[PDB]
């Protein structure tokens, strides 16, 4: 029946994330249970079950990537038996006749759904760091270059002492670091339950090796290790933890924190006209839509995580099934939301596109009302009292808010300051003394020592994933 | 106002916390506050201050615990200049005064606040590693002893695969062991904001030092140096990043899964008679799994303080927004003593769970029976005979059992009517040995001494000196 008369999520269609989205297909589901029941076929046979042939090994090599009809005759097999994985044990067995014998010989339904999933999650974030790492890239080029742009600075979102457009990005390529350290822990910690059997006790594989514990052991590690896995969980019931989910999600669900305040930040920026989101194809008025799309995606990853975090919380003894659903919309949505989310930012990051001027303008109407003090000490050392110039200054800036607040005119304190007598030892000295470069404190310094080395030093290990465009 | 007339935290008046409470105290806070102006001046000494005077540096050393007096009258200055940094540097300097122009020296006022609070964050990390060590140590222990007794496995919480107390309790184990690594990592991965001045440029300091960056940078790293922390964060906004909240509780988060499952599998074990919280003080038939019930009710209240912390993060615009003052004022304090309740009472627990072997004993009889069919099949198969026909022979009086069981509430009598019936009489006197329940359980006691001998040995060695006896 049509696409077009149900539902379809977009982690899924509306948004480009081909790879991420085949890690979580069906093909790759059935596909990635017969590569773990042709490496369950080589390692049992290593180990010692002479029952295994060469021959249907070799046949398993050649069909390991279902096809549609193959999928189509496990979904008739599947109505009739109501178990997926023996249905795919039929059907792999019907396209591999010598190795219809062995095909899942001793293994639990788990061996092959659990360890599938378990593939997928490192997977999907072998997919995503590289993503993450070209954002970092992308962004720190631009904290560079613009480390010495004095931008006005914001707490509660009101004027305050002037930053640079560099250092403001190091906040965010910051909070990435702290993402890529928690992604590549998660990444690592992976490992697969490999043969576990029914409860977690190996009972039946312990009896195909007639009792030889050693055996079983080699056979564990040995399958986990023709997968591409370092690390057999050596304690389960029938299912890895699910308290797995909740520590490989929280990298996503802390993520989602970086993305919504860079996003949020750069929307903001957008209305005050200093930064916009990359040209793509000149309009006067332009709408974040790229930010606003990432603040929408990234606000989804609080519930995934908590799917996670309730689901472990009531797996009742060797497991429960009240896992299967929600595992099979919180795991790949998830992966998904981030896999978009990268994708977006690296597209935001590539091209933020700077207004030094309507930045300037910004600056020049808020700064004299923070230079109180510098407008202060230059009088004091021309031989001016301290007190008499704090109250001078005061009644111009009075004068100024009004006009700025009450009459609604540009700021004219500097005005003021050139037209009130008292202040005229400083009046060739005012350009220097409201200059927004002796106002952003160390900010380009910061800026520059975090690229060069707080930044290089996070990447080094990931070079050969940065690319251009 | 009296205290029974106004609403109190559970968390901090009811259950025992005394030290994870204290850290999140007034006092505590403002005695940080002074010890953070203490190392302040120390450090702007070193890198060439000289205003400030050694007789300064001594006088605030004795006075780094605020009193009540002192709370009281930096109350009384608050209320009059709106303001609680000033107000208690006012104090501090009139309770010092030969360092009442030095105290706060070019800092401002979140170089106390923010700065307290990561010190508050690692503290009590600190005291919660330690707890969570020593339930690893208790229930480790308890599971190596009960490696070998058989106890009926449960999946969909129905009769499966025989395993063992100790490797069930393994499960658990594993959960906690990666609460340690995920605690520890966020324990190691906490700096200090150290000196940044209003918007994180350090402006104020670079003026005060007469433009000399080398001399802002090393004083940044001293004075975060001398509060006993490796990391400076070189890059912020007016605070730390809002985002450090968020990694800091996930390790709580998690954690409270591990102890949710832990508390609920042994409320049913108690249901079913086989695991009982430790005795307290004839002992009574029924008992309530109580202290288990209050571990799954604070367990559960974690997952909303993550999500205060997610949320904050999310929606601080710039170098800050005070939106994140108030709540973080109940979630980073509420998610410690939340976890530090959850581990006192896991210790208490797992110190003397009590284990009832023949009530799982006779659980496992009663269900053995219906899950040894291959095994029956195989006995006969190995005195000469045809599965086929055993395996029909089997299914019959399976049914019958199941009906007695079910319909009748009978004793299960499959085995009975095994040994009443003719065809079976080849294995009659095997029946008895055939169900024995240790041939079942797979490699459940191997697995858990392994495991508890290798995995969690090899975890808890970096923390032996914590391990304490009761
Ligand atoms: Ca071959
Ligand atoms: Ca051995
Ligand atoms: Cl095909
Ligand atoms: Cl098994
Ligand atoms: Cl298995
Ligand atoms: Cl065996
Ligand atoms: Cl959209
Ligand atoms: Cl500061
Ligand atoms: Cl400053
Ligand atoms: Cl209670
Ligand atoms: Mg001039
Ligand atoms: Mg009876």
Redesign the interface.
């Known amino acids: 029946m049509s696409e077009y008369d149900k539902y379809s999520t977009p982690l899924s269609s509306r948004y480009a994330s081909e790879e991420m989205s085949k890690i979580f297909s069906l093909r790759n589901r059935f596909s990635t249970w017969r590569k773990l029941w042709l490496n369950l076929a080589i390692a049992e046979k290593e180990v010692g079950l002479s029952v295994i042939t060469d021959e249907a090994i070799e046949q398993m090599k050649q069909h390991l990537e279902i096809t549609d009809k193959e999928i189509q005759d496990a979904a008739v097999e599947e109505a009739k038996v109501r178990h997926d994985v023996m249905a795919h044990v039929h059907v792999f067995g019907e396209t591999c006749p010598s190795a219809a014998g062995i095909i899942h010989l001793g293994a639990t339904s788990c061996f092959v759904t659990d360890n599938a999933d378990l593939i997928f999650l490192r997977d999907a974030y072998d997919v995503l760091i590289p993503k993450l790492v070209n954002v970092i890239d992308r962004l720190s080029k631009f904290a560079l270059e613009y480390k010495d742009l004095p931008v006005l ?5 009101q004027p ?4 640079t457009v560099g ?2 990005a ?2 965010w ?3 990435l670091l ?1 993402d890529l ?2 992604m590549v ?1 998660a990444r690592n ?1 992976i490992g697969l339950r490999g043969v576990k ?8 594989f ?1 009896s195909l090796f007639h009792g030889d ?1 050693d055996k ?1 052991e080699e056979l564990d590690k040995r399958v986990v290790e023709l997968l591409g896995f370092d690390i057999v ?6 299912t890895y ?4 989910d ?2 490989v999600l ?1 990298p996503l ?2 993520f ?3 993305a ?2 860079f996003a ?2 750069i929307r ?1 920026l957008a209305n005050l006209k200093e930064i916009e989101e990359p040209f793509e194809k000149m309009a006067y008025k332009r709408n974040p839509m790229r930010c606003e799309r990432v603040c929408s995606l ?2 989804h990853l ?1 519930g995934l ?2 799917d996670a ?2 689901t ?10 009240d896992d299967s659903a929600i595992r099979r919309i919180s795991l790949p949505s998830a992966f998904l939301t981030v896999d978009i989310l990268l994708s977006t930012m690296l597209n935001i990051t590539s091209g933020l596109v700077v207004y030094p001027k309507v930045i300037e303008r910004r600056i020049n109407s808020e700064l004299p009302f923070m230079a109180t003090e510098n407008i202060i000490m230059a009088m004091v050392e021309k031989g001016g009292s301290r007190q008499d110039c704090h109250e001078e200054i005061r009644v111009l800036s009075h004068q100024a808010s009004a006009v700025v607040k009450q009459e609604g005119g540009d700021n004219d304190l500097i005005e003021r300051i050139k037209s009130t007598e008292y202040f005229k030892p400083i009046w060739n000295d005012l350009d220097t003394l409201l200059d927004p470069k002796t ?5 380009p ?3 520059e ?2 690229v060069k080395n ?1 930044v290089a030093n996070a990447l080094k290990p990931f070079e050969k994933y940065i690319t251009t465009e």
């Open positions: 600075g914001w707490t509660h979102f305050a002492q002037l930053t250092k403001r190091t906040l390529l910051q909070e702290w350290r928690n822990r910690d059997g029914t409860t977690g006790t190996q009972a039946s312990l514990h079983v969980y050596p304690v389960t019931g029938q933890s699910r308290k797995i909740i520590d929280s669900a802390s989602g924190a970086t919504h305040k949020t930040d903001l990234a606000r609080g995580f908590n975090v309730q472990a919380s009531v797996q009742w003894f060797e497991r429960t099934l106002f952003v404190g160390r900010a310094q910061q800026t020592k975090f707080d």
